[PDB]
Amino acid sequence: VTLGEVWKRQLNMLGKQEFERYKVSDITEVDRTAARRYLKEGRTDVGISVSRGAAKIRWLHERGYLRITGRVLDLGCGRGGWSYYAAAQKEVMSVKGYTLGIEGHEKPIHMQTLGWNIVKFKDKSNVFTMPTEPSDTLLCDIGESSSNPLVERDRTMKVLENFERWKHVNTENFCVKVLAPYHPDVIEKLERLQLRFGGGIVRVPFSRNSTHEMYYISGARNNITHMVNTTSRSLLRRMTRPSGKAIIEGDVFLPTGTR
């Protein structure tokens, strides 16, 4: 019924080469070559980011959709790309990152980029079972893709329900992943969250066309349905006229040392 639902159905029907071409079409992308080379040599001292995810929070921060201040909580921190980006910012007092870490490449990776000494990581943490704690800036980047839209809907609602649980009175700043924002249930829930907490929703250009993920943020006020639909239209437009080419820019580089 929604344009996002049409997008998801069409996406799932794409042939293999069509899918690969489509997913990068007109997206923005950071060049990860430098960071990967250094990490391969165990060079944790260097001013690099541990993940591609850092590019998303940099865009959100630099473009004024999110202020990053005080006590930062990073729910689903993974390797720590957002946590280390936050730690380098002058208004940040501390960072606590929690993540499941049920694989491997997806546990926190220690680094010595700026403010590393004010970051504390806890692996094997389920943020859904944990008690909440206060924060000034609440970040959450959880939402695991599924070809099944109903699974994506369920996962999104769970994340939003838990976000509301964690969203404290002193939480002025927030950024939550909305995996599948186009589902009517998700739109309806976000609208009620917005009445309580204000804020708005945004598409980060570093997201692949193969996901409809958007971010609910504190830094801008906008119309949820309008913003989601505009993204659905962009995604469908790219599907009918795919360039097959991403726009590559410089990675998230950071200063180094203690704070």
Ligand X SMILES: Nc1ncnc2c1ncn2[C@@H]1O[C@H](C[C@@H](N)CC[C@H](N)C(=O)O)[C@@H](O)[C@H]1O
> Where along the sequence are the contacts to ligand X (CB under 6 A)?
51, 53-54, 76-82, 98-100, 106, 125-128, 141-142
Q: How far is the CB of 25 from ligand GTA (least distance, A)?
A: 13
Q: How far is the CB of 65 from ligand GTA (least distance, A)?
A: 23
Q: Which does 81 bind (CB under 5 to 8 A by kind): ligand X, ligand GTA, none?
A: ligand X
C-alpha span between 186 and 208 (Å, rounded): 20
- DSSP string over the chain: --HHHHHHHHHHH--HHHHHHHHTTT-EEEE-HHHHHHHHTT-TTSS--SSTTHHHHHHHHHTTS----EEEEEET-TTSHHHHHHHTSTTEEEEEEE----SGGGS-----BTTGGGEEEESS--TTTSPP---SEEEE------SSHHHHHHHHHHHHHHHHHH--TT--EEEEEESSTTSHHHHHHHHHHHHHH--EEE--TTS-TT---EEEESS----HHHHHHHHHHHHHHHHHS-----EEEE-----BS--
Q: Which does 51 bind (CB under 5 to 8 A by kind): ligand X, ligand GTA, none?
A: ligand X
Provide the binding-site residues for ligand GTA, judged by CB under 6 A: 11-12, 14, 16, 19, 23, 145-147, 208, 210-211
Q: Which is nearer to ligand GTA, 174 or 215 (CB)?
A: 215
Q: Which does 12 bind (CB under 5 to 8 A by kind): ligand GTA, ligand X, none?
A: ligand GTA
Q: Which is nearer to ligand X, 102 or 243 (CB)?
A: 102
Q: Which does 128 bind (CB under 5 to 8 A by kind): ligand X, ligand GTA, none?
A: ligand X
Q: Which is nearer to ligand GTA, 116 or 182 (CB)?
A: 182
Q: How far is the CB of 109 from ligand X (least distance, A)?
A: 9
Q: Which is nearer to ligand X, 235 or 252 (CB)?
A: 252
Residue type, 152: E
Q: Which is nearer to ligand X, 198 or 255 (CB)?
A: 255
Q: Which does 16 bind (CB under 5 to 8 A by kind): ligand GTA, ligand X, none?
A: ligand GTA
